[PDB]
């Protein structure tokens, strides 16, 4: 009744998306549903072993936007039989059978359904905002309109392009490239703080941030 | 010509402006 | 400097600035840049906008948000 | 607060101009100002400028990443910043 | 906040469906979301002109069940930007961009997405149950897993069976056959009432129900 | 209240037995009772029985449907029950 | 009777009772029915369970619900 | 043989137990 509805509200605001939604819109979307210190984590197994990516609050708007940059024109989450748990200060939601659904546009409109465990922690207050978001992807499917199979039906070169997936584990290149970049850039933010306070060159900022590290 | 002028690319092979994270 | 990723770092920056100039609509600046730097004109682009713009959007988001 | 896309776009524009100057590409630098019809005033920083300095320590940390350490020359302070 | 959540609750109870749900389960599902005199209407254009089918409350459980009899293993409704309107006694919900989504099972798992206008009237009380349900179908799409395209990839006879739709306007045969049968059987219920009260043969029951008709 | 599937299944079973009797198929009727292992007692109604009577006025109304009136012989009271 | 859909109605009922008997597992009753009624054994079935069962489920739902 | 005994089907053509509403 509380956490379940929040995801429905989240799905509902994503239906307002248009191509002109930008930095300010995605930041407003993220402030409505996430804490100022929210953490978001995505997990999957593309090649080699398991990959895990974790980003903080200021990187969370562009994560969601990257899904739309990737071709998605619609995004929603279906949570089948999620487990609630109330604590003194937060509420957990744990859904082993979570589905992330995206609809791509012209041409050859394709639908991507990503399955995984969605684990959430909400703040127990009025704006029941998300403190942690953890999505562990197990597998994904990609669906083709029957009309667009019949379109490229007797065209051997177009019809084997239709057997190639369009995402890798449900992540399109936009999203994957973004999360990987965020590994390097996001702890540079400490360097950037230094730069803003002491007038010091970035490489000296870095030099000085090795200082705290070996010290403790 | 000012100290931080760019290197030559003695690599003549066709350079690609690809994302430095994209997999090959 | 004497850091050993520097020449490649600066190779790449130049490569991405040129891609940025082309995708931003600065056709002549891009052509001029190449000849001002002694680079043979045979660079193939990514998709618009290139990496420099994408890298910058994340960097500046973090830079603005970085506190005192 | 949070920057808009245009604020970010224009800040990148300025710093690429600075980059072009400090890199010995003054011709490109002013061509660029005209192709994008820049009009406001510009004052710039010491070489190599904001973009060049930040890009280069970003590229260092990239190369000093655990998964790229070998097969990518990098500095040692970047390596240890990870650890 | 009120009507919107009711459809989410309706989607949520449909996730409890299994193959062993029966008369009692579907009747319990219908009593939770519909009035005892609820009316449900489905509209579409298959061939010839427009078809319209309307059923009362005791026929509504098997309508929803017929969707699952037809192959669906999952059913949910997505309402994009629905219009609310509060009155003294009821609440309307009007959604021009409604989507009815069903997932079929083995073999060749197919997803059916039916688009139309969903118009609902809810009772304004505690159990905000549905008084009228009106779904006017405009078009439907059918989606094929890319894996199951690649399965029958170089098999010309299986791959043109994959260009044939599996529903007609999103209605599978089970549902269509059910609604058509209900046209004839549902007003026979008046005959059946007669039969239960006066001991009279069914054809005499019918004879006697022509009596009211020409009388007024 | 509302009938269960098994209640409905068994009620249909009974009425098909009755149907088989009144239709001159006594052999089928008792074979059926055995193949389905019916044990409870049966008392039945006047011919043609519940199923036959209701099926036949259902089939009439079917044929008297506006969309089947022509090309399907039907009664007139069924026709007018619609109208 | 004298209603003119009756012979077809009764043709169809017999047809569906036979389908019902086969889909319900009454193999011999079905075979016996055919010969007890003078019907050549060449009937092709729908899918299980046939129409009689489907028709009955709707009919009995309505019959039980029909009030006094 | 009891009054409501079924008609003959003089129609020898292969009879189909199909749903009387399904379209052809």
Numbering used by the authors:
A (entry chain V), E (entry chain V): 65 to 280
B (entry chain D), H (entry chain D): 58 to 81
C (entry chain B), G (entry chain B): 10 to 77
D (entry chain A), F (entry chain A): 11 to 93
How is this structure described in the published paper?
The Wnt enhanceosome is responsible for transactivation of Wnt-responsive genes and a promising therapeutic target for treatment of numerous cancers with Adenomatous Polyposis Coli (APC) or β-catenin mutations. Here we show that B-cell lymphoma 9 protein (BCL9), Pygopus (Pygo), LIM domain-binding protein 1 (LDB1) and single-stranded DNA-binding protein (SSBP) form a stable core complex within the Wnt enhanceosome. Their mutual interactions rely on a highly conserved N-terminal asparagine proline phenylalanine (NPF) motif of Pygo, through which the BCL9-Pygo complex binds to the LDB-SSBP core complex. Pygo proteins contain three highly conserved domains: a nuclear localization signal (NLS), an N-terminal homology domain (also called N-box) including a highly conserved NPF motif and a C-terminal plant homology domain (PHD).
To provide a structural basis for the Pygo2-ChiLS interaction, we determined the crystal structure of the ternary complex assembled from human Pygo2(58–84), LDB1(56–285) and SSBP2(1–94) at 2.45 Å resolution. In our crystal lattice, there is one Pygo2 molecule and one LDB1-(SSBP2)2 complex in each asymmetric unit. Pygo2(58–84) adopts an unstructured loop, confirming secondary structure predictions. Its N-terminus is located on the surface of the SSBP2 dimer whereas its C-terminus protrudes into a pocket formed by the interface between LDB1 and SSBP2. The structure of the ChiLS core complex is almost identical to the previously reported structure of ChiLS30 (RMSD = 0.366 Å), indicating that the binding of Pygo2 to ChiLS does not alter its overall conformation. However, there was one marked conformational difference for a loop of SSBP2 (amino acids 49–51): a lysine residue within this loop (K50) shifted by about 6.6 Å, tilting away from the bound Pygo2, thereby avoiding a clash with Pygo2 M68 and L72. Pygo2(58–84) interacts with ChiLS through three sets of contacts. Firstly, F68, W69 and Y72 of one SSBP2 molecule and Y25, F60 and W64 of another, together with L245 and I248 of LDB1, form a deep hydrophobic pocket that interacts with NPF (residues 76–78) of Pygo2(58–84). Secondly, the PPP cluster (residues 63–65) and L72 of Pygo2(58–84) are accommodated by a hydrophobic groove formed largely by W48 and H62 of SSBP2. Thirdly, LDB1 R232 and R244 undergo tight hydrogen bonds with D80 within the NPF motif of Pygo2, and we also note salt bridges between Pygo2 E79 and LDB1 N237 and N241.
